[PDB]
Design a protein around this motif. Sequence first.
Motif, PDB file in Angstrom:
ATOM      1  N   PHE A 182       3.449   8.556   1.698  1.00 20.64           N
ATOM      2  CA  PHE A 182       3.562   7.294   0.987  1.00 20.64           C
ATOM      3  C   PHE A 182       4.463   7.449  -0.230  1.00 20.64           C
ATOM      4  CE2 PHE A 182      -0.889   7.030   2.735  1.00 20.64           C
ATOM      5  CZ  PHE A 182      -0.558   6.197   3.788  1.00 20.64           C
ATOM      6  N   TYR A 216      -5.524  -2.914   3.884  1.00 19.65           N
ATOM      7  CA  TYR A 216      -4.555  -3.925   4.298  1.00 19.65           C
ATOM      8  C   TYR A 216      -4.804  -4.431   5.714  1.00 19.65           C
ATOM      9  CZ  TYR A 216      -2.235  -0.069   6.739  1.00 19.65           C
ATOM     10  OH  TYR A 216      -1.952   0.983   7.570  1.00 19.65           O
ATOM     11  N   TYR A 252       0.807  -1.216   0.000  1.00 15.26           N
ATOM     12  CA  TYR A 252       0.000   0.000   0.000  1.00 15.26           C
ATOM     13  C   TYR A 252       0.845   1.273   0.000  1.00 15.26           C
ATOM     14  CZ  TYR A 252       1.067   0.317   4.992  1.00 15.26           C
ATOM     15  OH  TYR A 252       1.710   0.408   6.198  1.00 15.26           O
ATOM     16  N   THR A 253       2.085   1.210   0.497  1.00 17.53           N
ATOM     17  CA  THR A 253       2.965   2.374   0.464  1.00 17.53           C
ATOM     18  C   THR A 253       3.307   2.813  -0.957  1.00 17.53           C
ATOM     19  OG1 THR A 253       4.885   0.920   0.733  1.00 17.53           O
ATOM     20  CG2 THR A 253       3.955   1.907   2.711  1.00 17.53           C
ATOM     21  N   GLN A 268       1.291   2.404  -3.607  1.00  9.85           N
ATOM     22  CA  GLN A 268       0.064   2.480  -4.390  1.00  9.85           C
ATOM     23  C   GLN A 268      -0.796   3.681  -4.016  1.00  9.85           C
ATOM     24  OE1 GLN A 268      -1.342  -1.391  -3.386  1.00  9.85           O
ATOM     25  NE2 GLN A 268       0.339  -2.406  -4.468  1.00  9.85           N
ATOM     26  N   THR A 269      -1.175   3.829  -2.753  1.00 15.98           N
ATOM     27  CA  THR A 269      -2.065   4.925  -2.398  1.00 15.98           C
ATOM     28  C   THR A 269      -1.324   6.259  -2.380  1.00 15.98           C
ATOM     29  OG1 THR A 269      -3.732   5.674  -0.803  1.00 15.98           O
ATOM     30  CG2 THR A 269      -1.778   4.629   0.084  1.00 15.98           C
ATOM     31  N   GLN A 270      -2.043   7.300  -2.778  1.00 12.71           N
ATOM     32  CA  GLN A 270      -1.508   8.648  -2.805  1.00 12.71           C
ATOM     33  C   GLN A 270      -1.422   9.224  -1.401  1.00 12.71           C
ATOM     34  OE1 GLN A 270      -0.392   8.275  -6.137  1.00 12.71           O
ATOM     35  NE2 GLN A 270      -0.548  10.508  -5.984  1.00 12.71           N
ATOM     36  N   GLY A 271      -0.468  10.121  -1.216  1.00 15.45           N
ATOM     37  CA  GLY A 271      -0.278  10.756   0.066  1.00 15.45           C
ATOM     38  C   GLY A 271       1.141  11.237   0.201  1.00 15.45           C
ATOM     39  N   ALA A 291       4.071   6.305  -3.364  1.00 16.37           N
ATOM     40  CA  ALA A 291       3.419   6.004  -4.635  1.00 16.37           C
ATOM     41  C   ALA A 291       4.155   6.650  -5.802  1.00 16.37           C
ATOM     42  CB  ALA A 291       1.961   6.453  -4.608  1.00 16.37           C
ATOM     43  N   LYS A 302     -10.483   2.824   4.168  1.00 15.99           N
ATOM     44  CA  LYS A 302      -9.355   3.689   3.833  1.00 15.99           C
ATOM     45  C   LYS A 302      -8.029   2.942   3.914  1.00 15.99           C
ATOM     46  CE  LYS A 302      -7.526   8.294   4.606  1.00 15.99           C
ATOM     47  NZ  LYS A 302      -6.311   7.764   3.934  1.00 15.99           N
ATOM     48  N   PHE A 303      -7.918   1.970   4.816  1.00 19.89           N
ATOM     49  CA  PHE A 303      -6.704   1.176   5.000  1.00 19.89           C
ATOM     50  C   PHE A 303      -7.107  -0.279   4.805  1.00 19.89           C
ATOM     51  CE2 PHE A 303      -6.670   4.830   7.805  1.00 19.89           C
ATOM     52  CZ  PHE A 303      -5.568   5.510   7.348  1.00 19.89           C
TER      53      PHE A 303
END
Lengths: 266, 162, 162, 162, 75, 172, 172, 172, 172
Positions: C74, D65, C65-66, C68-71, C76, D62-63
């Motif tokens: 993270f 995983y 998920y680090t 892939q998801t925007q933020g 991505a 939202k999470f």
Amino acid sequence: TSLVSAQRLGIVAVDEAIPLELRSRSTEEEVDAVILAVYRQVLGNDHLMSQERLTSAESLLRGREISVRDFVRAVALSEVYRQKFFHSNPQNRFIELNYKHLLGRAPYDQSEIAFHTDLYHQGGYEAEINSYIDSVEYTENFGDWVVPYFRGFATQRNQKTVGFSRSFQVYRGYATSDRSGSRSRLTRELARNTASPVYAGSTAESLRGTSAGSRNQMYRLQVIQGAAGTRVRRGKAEYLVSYDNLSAKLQQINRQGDTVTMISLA
Amino acid sequence: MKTPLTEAVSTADSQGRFLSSTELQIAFGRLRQANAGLQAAKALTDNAQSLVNGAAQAVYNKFPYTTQTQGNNFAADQRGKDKCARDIGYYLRIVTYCLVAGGTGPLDEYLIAGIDEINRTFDLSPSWYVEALKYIKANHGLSGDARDEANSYLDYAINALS
Amino acid sequence: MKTPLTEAVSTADSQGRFLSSTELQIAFGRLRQANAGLQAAKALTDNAQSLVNGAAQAVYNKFPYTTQTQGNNFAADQRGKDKCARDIGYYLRIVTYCLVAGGTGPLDEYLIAGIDEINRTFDLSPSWYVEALKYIKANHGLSGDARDEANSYLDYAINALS
Amino acid sequence: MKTPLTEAVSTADSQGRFLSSTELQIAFGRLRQANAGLQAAKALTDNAQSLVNGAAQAVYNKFPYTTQTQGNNFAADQRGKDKCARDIGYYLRIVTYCLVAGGTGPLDEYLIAGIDEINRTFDLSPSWYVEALKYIKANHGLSGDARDEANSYLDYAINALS
Amino acid sequence: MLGQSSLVGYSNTQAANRVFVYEVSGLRQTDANENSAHDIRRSGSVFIKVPYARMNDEMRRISRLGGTIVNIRPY
Amino acid sequence: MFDVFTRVVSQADARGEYLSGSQLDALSATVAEGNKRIDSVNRITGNASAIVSNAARALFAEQPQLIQPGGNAYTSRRMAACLRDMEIILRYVTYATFTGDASVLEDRCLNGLRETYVALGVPGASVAAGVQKMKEAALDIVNDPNGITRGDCSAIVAEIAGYFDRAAAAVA
Amino acid sequence: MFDVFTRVVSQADARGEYLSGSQLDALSATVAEGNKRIDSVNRITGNASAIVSNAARALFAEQPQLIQPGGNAYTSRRMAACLRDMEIILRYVTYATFTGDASVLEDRCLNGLRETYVALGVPGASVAAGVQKMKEAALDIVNDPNGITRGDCSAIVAEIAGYFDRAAAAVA
Amino acid sequence: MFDVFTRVVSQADARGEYLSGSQLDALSATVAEGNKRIDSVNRITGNASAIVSNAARALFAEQPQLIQPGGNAYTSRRMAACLRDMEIILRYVTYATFTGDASVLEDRCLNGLRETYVALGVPGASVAAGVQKMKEAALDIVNDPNGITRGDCSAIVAEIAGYFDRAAAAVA
Amino acid sequence: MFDVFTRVVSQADARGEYLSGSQLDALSATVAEGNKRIDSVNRITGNASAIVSNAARALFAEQPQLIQPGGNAYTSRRMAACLRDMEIILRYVTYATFTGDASVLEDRCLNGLRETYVALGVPGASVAAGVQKMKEAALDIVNDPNGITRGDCSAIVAEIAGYFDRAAAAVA
Ligand SMILES: *[C@@H](C)[C@H]1/C(=C/c2[nH]c(/C=C3N=C(/C=C4\NC(=O)C(CC)=C4C)C(C)=C\3CCC(=O)O)c(CCC(=O)O)c2C)NC(=O)[C@@H]1C
Ligand SMILES: *[C@@H](C)[C@H]1/C(=C/c2[nH]c(/C=C3N=C(/C=C4\NC(=O)C(CC)=C4C)C(C)=C\3CCC(=O)O)c(CCC(=O)O)c2C)NC(=O)[C@@H]1C
Ligand SMILES: *[C@@H](C)[C@H]1/C(=C/c2[nH]c(/C=C3N=C(/C=C4\NC(=O)C(CC)=C4C)C(C)=C\3CCC(=O)O)c(CCC(=O)O)c2C)NC(=O)[C@@H]1C
Ligand SMILES: *[C@H](C)[C@H]1/C(=C/c2[nH]c(/C=C3N=C(/C=C4\NC(=O)C(CC)=C4C)C(C)=C\3CCC(=O)O)c(CCC(=O)O)c2C)NC(=O)[C@@H]1C
Ligand SMILES: *[C@H](C)[C@H]1/C(=C/c2[nH]c(/C=C3N=C(/C=C4\NC(=O)C(CC)=C4C)C(C)=C\3CCC(=O)O)c(CCC(=O)O)c2C)NC(=O)[C@@H]1C
Ligand SMILES: *[C@H](C)[C@H]1/C(=C/c2[nH]c(/C=C3N=C(/C=C4\NC(=O)C(CC)=C4C)C(C)=C\3CCC(=O)O)c(CCC(=O)O)c2C)NC(=O)[C@@H]1C
Ligand SMILES: *[C@H](C)[C@H]1/C(=C/c2[nH]c(/C=C3N=C(/C=C4\NC(=O)C(CC)=C4C)C(C)=C\3CCC(=O)O)c(CCC(=O)O)c2C)NC(=O)[C@@H]1C
Ligand SMILES: *[C@H](C)[C@H]1/C(=C/c2[nH]c(/C=C3N=C(/C=C4\NC(=O)C(CC)=C4C)C(C)=C\3CCC(=O)O)c(CCC(=O)O)c2C)NC(=O)[C@@H]1C
Ligand SMILES: *[C@H](C)[C@H]1/C(=C/c2[nH]c(/C=C3N=C(/C=C4\NC(=O)C(CC)=C4C)C(C)=C\3CCC(=O)O)c(CCC(=O)O)c2C)NC(=O)[C@@H]1C
Ligand SMILES: *[C@H](C)[C@H]1/C(=C/c2[nH]c(/C=C3N=C(/C=C4\NC(=O)C(CC)=C4C)C(C)=C\3CCC(=O)O)c(CCC(=O)O)c2C)NC(=O)[C@@H]1C
Ligand SMILES: *[C@H](C)[C@H]1/C(=C/c2[nH]c(/C=C3N=C(/C=C4\NC(=O)C(CC)=C4C)C(C)=C\3CCC(=O)O)c(CCC(=O)O)c2C)NC(=O)[C@@H]1C
């Protein structure tokens, strides 16, 4: 306190003590007296050997490089203070020794035990010690130039009453010191937010007459009792027994499962 | 006590930290020194009586007045000589304790702390004990690490007395 | 920084004392550990880039998920990956500093002090860096004292993180 | 325990003075706020279950995983989901306590103090709880002074976690 | 100008091994120090040596007591 | 300390449940008498010096052995200390009235006061009589109908009297 | 505190006697055992957070009333104090292992712990259960054979187990 | 603490009465005795080191168990603390002689001393024996007729002996 | 504080780079000289009192104005302060030799010493001469080939000489 209670409680010398302030342009004997007072009060009235003296810290105090508060901090952080108050003591005993040496009072609340315990666990001995010296209480009472002195026997602002009583648990007399590993006497009192009767100086003694035994000595046994016999009317109990019946009282207290909190000569 | 293990744990406990690699290296140095220190302790112990008598005689030789003039602080009589021999035996025994413990902690706690008041109150000259320590250092017959460590303790006592 | 030599000097200075045999033993332990520490630091910095890339990939695989998801926190995008690789390089470089120094002092000075409020402030989970340090532990290929000292520093960082 | 009345008395007692008109105005402000706080607490209590389950679902969304990764700190099983729902319920209940009390005192005593140690040692991400609190803000359906005071407590918790 | 040896403590860190000189002026009787047992002796420029780790505390104390920090010098 | 709200909060948290409707309505009732609580606190504060001085005068008139030489209220230091103890008790009673809970009065003032007085030799019964006199005066003051909005202050008067009773029971 | 050497030194000084041969040989045997002692200290230290967290998790699994609302490990501050107590016990166990003597563990950690717990209501038996969980977790970590020079660590393991038992017994 | 004047002042103030004629004449008689009291204080002060050292030597000769290893006067620190106790007791006896009242002994020197000795394991009977030796030496020094105006100092010697005996009984 | 390792660590961290091969080889060479450094530290420590006292006596032999009345070394307190300062400078020089870095000596003893001595009226030139005498005594003692393994100690002696130079130049 006034004399009439002071002689009974054995706190006359504390009452007549005058705060010692290092003024500007102080002479050599004044710095000597300030250093002696700091060693006496911060190290809890131990016989301080010349090899345990902080020669550099007291030189800095002498040359006016540091303040009285800084010298107090240096003595408190020194390995001598650690050796005789920290490394062989439980944490609760250690912080009540810190309260006595640095703020001149007994702990007021169990939260003050929760503080300085978490503070130790996070920031070490140095941060924990600096909490007292940098506190508002130290600043308003002593500032940068007054040697700390015991204040628990006098009415302070923002003080709980119990402190006065608890003061007699940390100050055992003028000819006493905090030298001997030992457990705090205030652990249960602080944890359960209680007070214990003051048995200090001549307050502990009680009348004997012909009721005391062969050697005319009474003993006060303060115990915590519950129903295990006859009806118990109080959780706290006090027993005044002669020496000749002391063993018998101990054993009957023991077989009922009552916990002895204190035994003193009366 | 000033010994490497107690010092390391004291430093860690004051910081409230677990024992890291710094404390492990302290223990490793202690382990590297300990066997030499122990046989030095045994060498000093096995030769203790002759070392103490020889040190006492050396002090009496360098300061002959201690064996002639009367006074409670001197060794003119047998009582004073016994006190002197007992003092030198104390010095040697706590030096062996220092070798066993790997630091000056026995000397600090048992002999060094307050010794100035002792020598001033009973008017004993520290130079006598310095001479005794010099004899012990010159006649312990040790080599290498054991000698270096024992000499470090003896010179620690000498520097404390001067 | 916390090192055997500086801690020995600091506690000797606290008592106004010269360096006795205890501090010399601490220095001897430092000497015993130092060559292994220097060789471990050299070995770690030779393939530091490969170790950092592998640790970053291990974090990405362990935590997909680090990437892939925007933020902002993270990885991505390329900016997040560069920040992440820079963080892992920071960890490895300070570990090599600790190996050279002989204690966890560089980690405490440069990385450990304040790391928790950085991670909370920038919403970076410590588990990511725990995975990175575990990869560094599993893939440095060190042996003996080099291995043990490097693993002690890496485990120190992990324990501070978790 | 920060509430207006306890803080007013704490300040007056720290200055050793009787309660003046300043403390009277503190009590008047508390009185003006209390009814809205009580309806806010009642509205949150009656809607507590839907808020907790919806907040947990929002966090899981939202999470993602958290719902397939195996581990004690995640909610991929029923045990983890129960722990997660219980934690969010603790947050909601202590927020209601703050609304009843009129200050952040319940949050400071019961939840905020020590939460960082818990989230680190049990590797719980504070971002999960931030999202749960955000859902509670967006779905408590309060208006006026009830909303404002409840949002102040929820934002206090959010700022504590970030 | 000495003091560093005793002021910095035992953190051993490079960050704590810095002391600074604070010049403070205007320490008068405020409502903040009404119950001070000790008395203020000087309100002119006084110099306080503060280690880095206590710089947060001391200035707050100064700022709490109405003192004006006019200069801070590296030691 | 605890106030009237935080006491219910701590008990609910220990039980681990939300405040029920009955407890929320009870707190609504409590904030309904908030204005009278503020009035009672203000009225005792505005006449604190008169309460302490008149109660002390009545106590020393009824118990002359206190101010008699050798008595525990004799000498200006001891007398000043006695007047200070009366004012302190009155101040903490006002604190307990303000908060709606007795935790500040017990924890800060009353706990250890019996032991303190016994250790000092201060007659606890005499202090209790003085506190009773302060109680009587302060309840007259709180119940004065002049210059205030009409209403029923019986509950707050009973609560204040309860605090004064805790003080009197604690000292003796 | 004492270490393994200073304990013998203090006893000998309290007798005025030099260390005997047998005592010197015992200390030499302890010295030859030193590397395994350091390895055990390092291994427990390197896994200290995992040991504390896993033992605490297992303790709360088998004693749910600790984390139940109103329980002694309930509320963040209590739970953090509980984790701190576990970590403290582990740290002083490592200190005792390092010194070869239990004085640091006894003086700093165990002296007055039982009375503190009883006074505060912290269940000492539950603390003992947590200490035993850290016990077996650390004994498996110390006895782990891969990535270490092979050898017999049974004596060191017995000593560490004894420290963990002394702690467990002390808190209950 | 009190001197010879403030003792009767405090007694009279508790009684709330003026000093009678007999008390004023007794105080005048004490004042006429004052010069020999100053000589006794000066003579003890000028020979304090010899008094302490000789008394300590005699005590350790009579009780060699104190100075043998494991004894309470063994090691330099403990021996120096013992010498300081002796000096301190002698100094406070001089204080009592100077003030003419014993309250300085109870307030400071003997306030909790027996508790201190019991806590540390200092043998109180041995301290009492050392105090008795200092008493005999100091009384010999005070009674020395050489280099002083001849006169009767029996009352001041009896008072000094009383201070020494009270110090000895505090620890015996 | 810095030692020989943490100094290069600090430069590398400021540049944000790993230590190069040359820096690691230089540190390895430092490690190979560690035994000689420990020997030098031990020899100065074992002769510290002799070095300080002999240097002080020589410093007062020449420059007699220090010990004449009115001089800075006159009176016992100022002589004790002078002796103390010489020993303190030597102790920090040994610290600098032990760490292999001059940070401890500069930060804790040298920086600000010239201003303190000027504001006290301490002659910086004379104390610098005393530092030179301590230098010469310590360098002779370190370069004593009797009772030690033979070798080249030129590098460590040069480092010690540099530390002594630092303290002489900083104090004058
Ligand atoms: C210049 C400094 C002088 C010098 C030194 C020198 N020493 C060695 C070797 C050793 N010295 C030690 C030291 C100690 N062992 C102990 O137990 C203690 C007390 C804790 C000390 C101080 C050690 C361990 C060694 C190694 C073993 C050995 O004894 O040889 C050398 C040899 C080379 C080396 O650096 O290892 C040298 C050169 N020699 C001189 O000529 C100078 C006067
Ligand atoms: C029993 C205690 C007595 C009593 C009280 C009482 N007061 C009110 C009403 C109010 N009193 C106040 C108080 C203040 N306003 C201020 O600005 C100040 C200074 C800061 C104070 C102390 C207020 C704001 C009110 C409300 C408005 C009003 O003026 O009425 C009542 C009426 C009911 C209510 O709870 O508000 C009562 C009953 N009255 C008595 O009969 C007793 C002698
Ligand atoms: C018993 C104590 C011994 C004794 C004493 C004694 N002394 C005097 C007289 C005086 N002594 C002093 C004292 C001092 N003068 C100083 O300047 C100093 C230093 C500050 C001292 C201590 C003084 C002033 C006098 C008066 C002058 C004089 O020498 O006569 C007396 C005589 C009676 C009197 O009260 O003056 C006596 C009895 N005499 C003995 O026989 C005892 C051995
Ligand atoms: C000597 C005759 C005997 C003896 C003495 C001894 N005492 C202690 C320790 C302390 N002595 C005191 C006493 C005082 N301190 C004061 O300030 C006052 C004046 C009011 C007095 C009377 C105190 C408080 C202590 C506590 C410890 C301290 O260091 O101050 C010791 C030391 C015990 C120890 O080190 O554990 C000793 C040895 N011992 C003997 O055997 C003689 C019979
Ligand atoms: C001796 C060679 C010379 C000499 C010395 C001398 N120094 C002082 C006073 C001080 N010296 C210091 C220095 C330090 N104190 C420390 O703790 C440290 C380490 C951080 C150092 C470097 C200080 C601070 C003072 C002032 C405080 C004090 O006096 O102790 C004096 C006394 C000056 C005076 O009394 O006014 C003296 C005599 N004097 C000489 O003539 C020699 C050349
Ligand atoms: C011998 C080198 C010289 C000498 C010795 C001598 N010493 C004493 C008396 C004492 N010695 C000590 C020393 C210690 N006691 C300890 O516990 C320790 C630490 C373990 C030490 C170092 C003490 C305290 C005393 C006084 C008490 C006692 O009698 O034991 C004396 C007798 C002094 C007296 O007045 O009785 C003597 C004669 N004398 C010489 O002439 C030698 C050159
Ligand atoms: C990689 C494991 C994961 C990741 C990384 C990431 N980190 C940041 C930003 C910061 N990282 C730090 C950390 C340090 N700075 C230091 O000086 C040191 C000690 C020497 C450390 C360990 C800091 C301070 C920040 C914030 C400031 C900065 O950006 O430099 C980011 C950016 C986050 C943001 O909000 O900008 C990222 C992305 N994130 C992942 O997803 C990886 C799994
Ligand atoms: C015992 C619980 C387990 C075990 C231990 C064991 N270790 C050794 C030997 C060594 N271990 C070390 C340790 C370290 N080197 C480092 O650099 C560090 C970190 C700073 C550590 C902790 C060292 C130096 C040695 C000696 C050299 C060597 O590795 O052989 C042994 C061998 C015997 C000995 O005492 O030397 C043993 C038995 N072995 C097991 O099987 C247990 C699980
Ligand atoms: C839910 C948002 C996420 C999640 C939850 C989760 N939490 C835990 C464990 C604990 N939670 C707490 C928190 C509290 N305890 C309190 O008393 C209070 C204050 C009143 C709070 C906030 C604690 C202390 C723990 C650990 C002890 C316990 O188990 O109760 C877990 C389990 C962790 C473990 O190792 O057992 C989990 C799974 N998990 C998710 O995936 C969600 C996104
Ligand atoms: C007056 C009605 C009676 C009386 C009083 C009296 N009290 C004391 C001394 C003290 N009073 C307290 C009480 C408190 N201190 C606080 O800070 C608080 C609030 C938290 C309280 C309740 C304390 C601790 C003392 C002792 C310390 C001090 O005096 O400052 C005295 C003086 C006793 C003496 O001998 O000095 C007196 C006279 N006495 C009477 O006879 C009245 C019946
Ligand atoms: C966790 C397994 C169990 C538990 C623990 C718990 N302990 C306390 C409180 C304290 N614990 C200590 C002990 C120490 N503190 C130290 O610094 C040292 C090392 C030197 C020790 C041994 C102390 C002194 C306290 C009291 C002070 C404090 O609050 O920190 C608590 C808190 C109790 C309370 O808040 O009232 C808790 C929760 N509780 C459990 O239920 C577990 C079985």
